[PDB]
Amino acid sequence: CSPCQNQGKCKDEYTCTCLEGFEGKNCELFTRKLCSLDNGDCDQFCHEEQNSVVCSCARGYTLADNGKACIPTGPYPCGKQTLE
Amino acid sequence: IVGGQECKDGECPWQALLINEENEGFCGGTILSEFYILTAAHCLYQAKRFKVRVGDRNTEQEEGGEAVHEVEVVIKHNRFTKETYDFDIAVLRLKTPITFRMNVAPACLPERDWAESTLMTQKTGIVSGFGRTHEKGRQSTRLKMLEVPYVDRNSCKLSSSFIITQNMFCAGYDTKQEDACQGDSGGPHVTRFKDTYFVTGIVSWGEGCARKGKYGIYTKVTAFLKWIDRSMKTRGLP
Ligand SMILES: COC(=O)/C(C#N)=C(\Nc1cccc2c(Cl)c[nH]c12)N[C@H]1CCCCN(CC(=O)N2CCCC2)C1=O
Ligand SMILES: [Ca+2]
Ligand code: NA
């Protein structure tokens, strides 16, 4: 222990406990991203709102309370091949 | 479909088939919801009467699971242009609800801007239909799908003997013998994102099937997402 980045904590090898907004072994990667990258971590639609990512979903899905995943409202949501 | 594969059970559930007076399929369609089918405008002019069959995997055998629906309202894009096939899109409202089931499910309409950045930038899309399996061949009795690469616009325009408007896009291969064909017209072109399939095109036209230096021409659905919603908002009669 100085390996950790972006003011994360280094606890002796080592391990890094990052502040919110950073991740990676050394907290060297930003979590807060725009739609251009990893689709903003949205499962479906991504669109920006004040340098901020806001995810949404298609018909018959609802946005999980975590603001990213999409929850079907039935056995036959749009865009899914039918298993049964 | 030229080349590609037959569709397995539940693999292409949004596929609809337009059948004419003689109970014969003549164009494809995409299931948007329990009441709306998406197809091509030019298909409307190719049968005096027509219905919509869903859940059909083989036309030869009444294998059950199939369902036929009457069209209550045909909503053709008023800007559809016969000489160019610009605005080659239409929505059909059905008299009775489609029952979703195995092999019968809506494809997703994407948000426009997202689909521009996220769907239309992917390598490939999927097109499906009961069309001819050969340009010199015969309409498939079985539903087929085919992965087709997006072709950049410039390539598209210059490869083409006819006007490619901004409401169209190219997809397919330069020389490989895989392409959509007569009979597939109006059918689905969808794009996968994280295991969800989004409507991205309608089968429109092409110079033959799978000809060298030619692509399949698709209606660009992003251009019409706003128009599709306005047509669906009407819902049933007052
Ligand atoms: C067995 O021959 C065929 O299947 C032919 C022929 N030939 C064919 N295949 C075909 C039809 C529909 C979609 C595709 C895709 Cl995707 C690849 N192939 C397709 N389509 C023909 C159908 C006959 C009329 C000509 N025409 C329309 C046209 O040229 N224009 C130019 C601008 C305005 C519309 C065609 O699209
Ligand atoms: Ca049948
Ligand atoms: Na070709």
Q: Which of A39, A47, A82 sits opposite B105 (nearest CB)?
A: A82
Which ligand is in closest contact with the Cα of B82? 1
Element housing B31 (H / E): strand B25-31
Q: Are A39 and A26 in contact (CB under 8 A)?
A: no
Domains of chain B: 1-12+107-222 (2.40.10.10), 13-106+223-238 (2.40.10.10)
Q: Would you call A49 an interface residue with chain B, using a CB distance cutoff of 8 Å? A: no
Could you tell me if the CB of B97 is within 6 A of ligand 1? no
Nearest to A72 by CA among A59, A54, A81, A84: A59
Taking an 8 Å cut-off on Cβ atoms, the answer to whether B117 and A36 are in contact is yes
Nearest to B167 by CA among B213, B123, B118, B226: B226
What is the architecture, at CATH level 2, of domain A1-31?
Ribbon (2.10)
Out of B162, B207, B214, B218, mutate this one to test ligand 1's pocket (max ligand atoms within 8 Å of CB): namely B207
A13–chain B nearest CA distance, Å: 37
The resolution of the experimental structure, rounded to one decimal in Å, is: 2.3
Cα–Cα distance between B84 and B57 in angstroms, integer?
A: 32
What is the architecture, at CATH level 2, of domain A32-81?
Ribbon (2.10)
User: In sequence order, what are the residues at sequence separation of 6 or more whose Cβ sits closer than 8 angstroms to the Cβ of residue B61?
Assistant: none
Q: Which of B101, B113, B196 sits opposite A79 (nearest CB)?
A: B196
User: In sequence order, what are the residues at sequence separation of 6 or more whose Cβ sits closer than 8 angstroms to the Cβ of residue B40?
Assistant: B27, B88, B89, B90, B185, B186, B202, B203, B204, B219
Cα–Cα distance between A76 and A81 in angstroms, integer?
A: 9
Could you tell me if the CB of B139 is within 6 A of ligand 1? no
Taking an 8 Å cut-off on Cβ atoms, the answer to whether A82 and B108 are in contact is no
Which ligand is in closest contact with the Cα of B43? 1
Q: Are B6 and B142 in contact (CB under 8 A)?
A: yes
Cα–Cα distance between B197 and A45 in angstroms, integer?
A: 12
| Both tokens assigned to A13 | 């090898």
Tokens 């014969």 locate to B24
Could you tell me if the CB of B236 is within 6 A of ligand 1? no
Structural domain boundaries in chain A: 1-31, 32-81
Look at the alpha carbons of B14, B87, B51, B237 in this order and tell me if their dihedral is positive or negative: positive
Q: Do domains A1-31 and A32-81 have the same CATH topology?
A: yes
Technique of determination: X-ray
Look at the alpha carbons of B17, B222, B156, B75 in this order and tell me if their dihedral is positive or negative: positive
A57–chain B nearest CA distance, Å: 9
Quick check: helix, strand or coil at residue B181? Answer: coil
Could you tell me if the CB of B180 is within 6 A of ligand 1? yes
Nearest to B127 by CA among B10, B9, B12: B12
Ligand 2 centroid to residue B61 C-alpha, Å: 5
User: In sequence order, what are the residues at sequence separation of 6 or more whose Cβ sits closer than 8 angstroms to the Cβ of residue B53?
Assistant: B16, B17, B18, B19, B25, B66, B67, B68, B69
